[PDB]
Amino acid sequence: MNIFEMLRIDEGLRLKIYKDTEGYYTIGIGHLLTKSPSLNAAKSELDKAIGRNCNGVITKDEAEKLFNQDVDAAVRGILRNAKLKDVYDSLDAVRRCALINMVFQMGETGVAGFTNSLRMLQQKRWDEAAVNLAKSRWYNQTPNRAKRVITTFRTGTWDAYKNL
Numbered sequence: 001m002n003i004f005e006m007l008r009i010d011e012g013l014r015l016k017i018y019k020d021t022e023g024y025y026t027i028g029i030g031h032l033l034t035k036s037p038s039l040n041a042a043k044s045e046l047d048k049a050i051g052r053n054c055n056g057v058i059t060k061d062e063a064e065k066l067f068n069q070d071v072d073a074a075v076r077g078i079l080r081n082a083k084l085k086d087v088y089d090s091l092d093a094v095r096r097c098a099l100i101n102m103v104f105q106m107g108e109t110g111v112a113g114f115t116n117s118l119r120m121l122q123q124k125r126w127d128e129a130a131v132n133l134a135k136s137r138w139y140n141q142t143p144n145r146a147k148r149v150i151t152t153f154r155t156g157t158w159d160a161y162k163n164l
Contacts, residue, residue: 002097003097003101005161006101006158006161007029007071007101007104008067009161010030010105011029012029013063014026014027015057015060016056016057017043017046017057025045027046028058028063029063029070030104030105031049031063031066033045033046039056042056043055043056050062071104074103077103078099081108083118084108084111084112087118087122090121090124094152094156094157095152095156098152098153099111099121101152117132117133120132126153126155127154129154130153133149147160148164
């Protein structure tokens with residue numbers, strides 16, 4: 001299992017504009033287009049993103065391209081953020097995947113706000129951090145996905161996904 005397979009499980013693949021769990025316009029593998037309510041604003045962002053007139057629809061190839069860019073940007077964003085980078089560097093390979101997953105879903109800023117959990121992960125207090133991460137809007141809003149990520153940080157294995 002790897003970061004790509006993991007995220008593909010969590011986000012799904014949709015070739016037509018859709019609304020995410022938060023009601024935002026998205027396409028592909030969890031690629032947020034706009035927080036704006038206008039499907040029109042969405043279609044415009046899409047065309048800008050792909051470089052063609054898509055009319056709300058993309059191919060598999062285009063979805064995967066956006067996906068590659070997004071994962072890359074997630075990683076680069078962690079490495080550029082002081083707080084994030086220190087945690088990342090301290091972690092093993094599997095746990096690194098869990099942090100990337102959070103950043104991809106919620107943005108650098110959002111994850112950087114999990115101050116206490118970050119400190120626990122750095123200290124390698126697995127159980128404590130799992131309990132702290134669960135006390136969040138994140139967990140309450142998308143509990144099955146959050147539990148999968150949480151288990152990954154807790155155990156340092158891919159068990160939560162070997163089901164799926």
